From Swiss-Prot:
This is Bromodomain-containing protein 4. Residues 1-109 form the Bromo domain. The gene is BRD4. It comes from the Eukaryota. JQ1, a thieno-triazolo-1,4-diazepine derivative, and I-BET, a benzodiazepine derivative, have been tested on tumors with success. Treatment with GSK1210151A (I-BET151, a I-BET derivative) has strong effets on mixed lineage leukemia and promotes myeloid differentiation and leukemia stem-cell depletion. It is found in: Nucleus; Chromosome. Interacts with p53/TP53; the interaction is direct. Interacts (via CTD region) with CDK9 and CCNT1, acting as an associated component of P-TEFb complex. Interacts with RELA (when acetylated at 'Lys-310'). Interacts (via NET domain) with NSD3, CHD4, BICRA and ATAD5. The interaction with BICRA bridges BRD4 to the GBAF complex. Interacts (via NET domain) with JMJD6 (via JmjC and N-terminal domains); the interaction is stronger in presence of ssRNA and recruits JMJD6 on distal enhancers. Interacts with NSD3. Interacts with NIPBL.
Length: 110
């Protein structure tokens, strides 16, 4: 039950990494590099950074006890982007497009 849930979660994350979504998913592939992006206050505003590669590692290390915990990290990733950035910036529009994909697949899980 939990194992099939987490298998479905791996499938959702794999789709989020797929080329068909790459035009808007790519900023979320890896942890935010605050030095390269010059975001001097990012760590003060965002207490719990999250990204898709971290979620992938946590799935492989069986860190999620159920699909709810997986979904919470995905939504944390998007919420961090909404919290840090102006609402009409491009990276927020990209986050919203990727979140459309996530929310649809996540809702249709068994
Ligand atoms: C200069 O960076 C910023 O102003 C914020 C940064 N913007 C961006 C960003 C992403 C795409 C565009 Cl077109 C413009 C800015 C960003 C990431 S991660 C990453 C590799 C990038 C390039 N990001 C996330 C996730 N949340 N905020 C950002
Ligand atoms: C001149 O800068 C602005 O108008 C706003 C600034 N835009 C941006 C910004 C980021 C990405 C793009 Cl494509 C356009 C503007 C910005 C940051 S931090 C940072 C290093 C940059 C380049 N930012 C954040 C976070 N919130 N607002 C901004």
């Amino acid at each position: 039950k939990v194992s099939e849930q987490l298998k479905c979660c791996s499938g959702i994350l794999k789709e989020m990494f797929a080329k068909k979504h790459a035009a808007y998913a790519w900023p979320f592939y890896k942890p935010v590099d605050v030095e390269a992006l010059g975001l001097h206050d990012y760590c003060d505003i965002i207490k719990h950074p999250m990204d898709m590669s971290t979620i992938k590692s946590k799935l492989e290390a069986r860190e999620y006890r159920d699909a709810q915990e997986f979904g919470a990290d995905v939504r944390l990733m998007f919420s961090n982007c909404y919290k840090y950035n102006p609402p009409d910036h491009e990276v927020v529009a990209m986050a919203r497009k990727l979140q459309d994909v996530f929310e649809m697949r996540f809702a249709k899980m068994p």
